[PDB]
């Protein structure tokens, strides 16, 4: 009975393309068949190789550098560096055995744990932990494997689908810095903006300059969107994404939010916080602090004729996104009448 046009906005690697993948799983045909699977098997292997070669290459460049725990692995390091830039790598059995032995080296792992000091795809641990699965000749990627796959294709990508007679036309708008000049061109008859944030990347810097904090970049972009003159009446659904990785990072206790956002040291969990069942209170405090950084922007200015709807999301978790998207569906249905509450 209606067609809604939703824009996914957000910095690079925030989760936009992953959300589209979930929409296709839920409302189209997912990753289609063996042809797509097979063609995308190469992306998974290339992620695995990118992960291990990035970690290995970073060891000598960290300050202080990190050495192998077992010097017997030196030839494996050399092999990985040697094939780092081979086009169309063929992934023979020895690649997996060498990658796995390096992944198990405590020095390589120690370098991995300092990955916020270089640029490492978030799916590194996921794929490195299942080398034995991926290396099998009869390996077929699961939907989760394909969701975790990191392929940062620039451009604007679109999906359209119907749910209970309502159409949703969703735009995955590339958000790396050199793509943002194009954002305004997708603002054609927008129902709502979905702004996606990598909540877990508070201790990381962006690829574009290897200097600007990733979460600060997201906050700056959200401020740009929230206060934009041509979005004053367009509400913003905020996906505070990567909640799984955020919880892991908070609980590991090695990278403190307050070293990057000092006001966290004085931050108390709000009284109206609604932690999930089983949630560690340290994670609640972290995720609500990050939420409240965005809500401070949305309450500070630009709040005239639109609302912000925050959600905690895990874009690789299909059931999580089913639930959040259904909440979005209801938010959208309720927007028309809610607009009359505004002054």
Q: With CB cut-offs between 5 and 8 Å by kind, which of ligand GDP, Cl ion, Mg ion, none does residue 105 bind? A: none
Q: Are 201 and 214 in contact (CB under 8 A)?
A: yes
Rounded (10°) angle between helices 318-338 and 16-27: 90
Q: Are 186 and 9 in contact (CB under 8 A)?
A: no
Cβ closer to ligand GDP: 76 or 249?
A: 249
Instruction: Return the residue of 2, 133, 152, 342 that touches ligand GDP, per CB under 6 A.
Output: 152
Neighbouring-strand partners of residue 159: 170
Q: Does 302 engage in binding with ligand GDP (CB under 6 A)?
A: no
Residue nearest to Mg ion (CB): 17
Q: Does 14 engage in binding with Cl ion (CB under 5 A)?
A: yes
Q: With CB cut-offs between 5 and 8 Å by kind, which of Mg ion, Cl ion, ligand GDP, none does residue 18 bind? A: ligand GDP
Instruction: Return the residue of 48, 68, 134, 147 that touches ligand GDP, per CB under 6 A.
Output: 147
Q: Does 6 engage in binding with ligand GDP (CB under 6 A)?
A: no
Q: Which residue has the tokens 């609640």?
A: 284
Distance CA 338, CA 343 (A): 11
Q: Does 244 engage in binding with ligand GDP (CB under 6 A)?
A: yes
Q: With CB cut-offs between 5 and 8 Å by kind, which of Mg ion, ligand GDP, Cl ion, none does residue 147 bind? A: ligand GDP
Q: With CB cut-offs between 5 and 8 Å by kind, which of Mg ion, Cl ion, ligand GDP, none does residue 218 bind? A: Cl ion
* Site residues (CB under 5 A) for Mg ion, limited to 9-28: 17
Binding site for Mg ion (CB under 5 A): 17
Binding site for ligand GDP (CB under 6 A): 10, 12-18, 121-123, 147-148, 150, 152, 196, 241-242, 244-245, 314-316
């Amino acid at each position: 009975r209606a067609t809604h046009r939703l824009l996914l906005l957000g910095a690079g690697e925030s989760g936009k393309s992953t959300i589209v993948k979930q929409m296709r799983i839920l409302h189209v045909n997912g990753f289609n068949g063996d042809s797509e699977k097979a063609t995308k098997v190469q992306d998974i292997k290339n992620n695995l190789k990118e992960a291990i070669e990035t970690i290995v290459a970073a060891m000598s460049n960290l300050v202080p550098p990190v050495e192998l725990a077992n010097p017997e692995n030196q030839f494996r390091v050399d092999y990985i560096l040697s094939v780092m830039n081979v086009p169309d790598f063929d992934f023979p059995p020895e690649f997996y055995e060498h990658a796995k032995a390096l992944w198990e080296d405590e020095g390589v792992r120690a370098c991995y744990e300092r990955s916020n000091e270089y640029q490492l795809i978030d799916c590194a641990q996921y794929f490195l932990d299942k080398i034995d699965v991926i290396k099998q000749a009869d390996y077929v990627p699961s939907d989760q494997d394909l969701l975790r796959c990191c392929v940062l294709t620039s451009g604007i990508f679109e999906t359209k689908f119907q749910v209970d007679k309502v159409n949703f036309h969703m735009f995955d708008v590339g958000g790396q810095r050199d793509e943002r000049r194009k954002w305004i061109q997708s603002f054609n008859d927008v129902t709502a903006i979905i702004f996606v944030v990598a909540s877990s990347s508070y201790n990381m810097v962006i690829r574009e300059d290897n200097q600007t904090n990733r979460l600060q970049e997201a906050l700056n972009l959200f401020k740009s969107i929230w206060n934009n003159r041509w979005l004053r009446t367009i509400s913003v659904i905020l996906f505070l994404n990567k909640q799984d990785l955020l919880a892991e990072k908070v609980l590991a206790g090695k990278s403190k939010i307050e070293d990057y956002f000092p006001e966290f040291a004085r931050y108390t969990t709000p009284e109206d916080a609604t932690p999930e069942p089983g949630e560690d209170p340290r994670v609640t405090r972290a995720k609500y602090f990050i939420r409240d950084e965005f809500l401070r922007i949305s309450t500070a200015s630009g709040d005239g004729r639109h609302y912000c709807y925050p959600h905690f999301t895990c874009a690789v978790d299909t059931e999580n996104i089913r639930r959040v998207f259904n909440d979005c569906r209801d938010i959208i249905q309720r927007m028309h009448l809610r607009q009359y509450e505004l002054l």
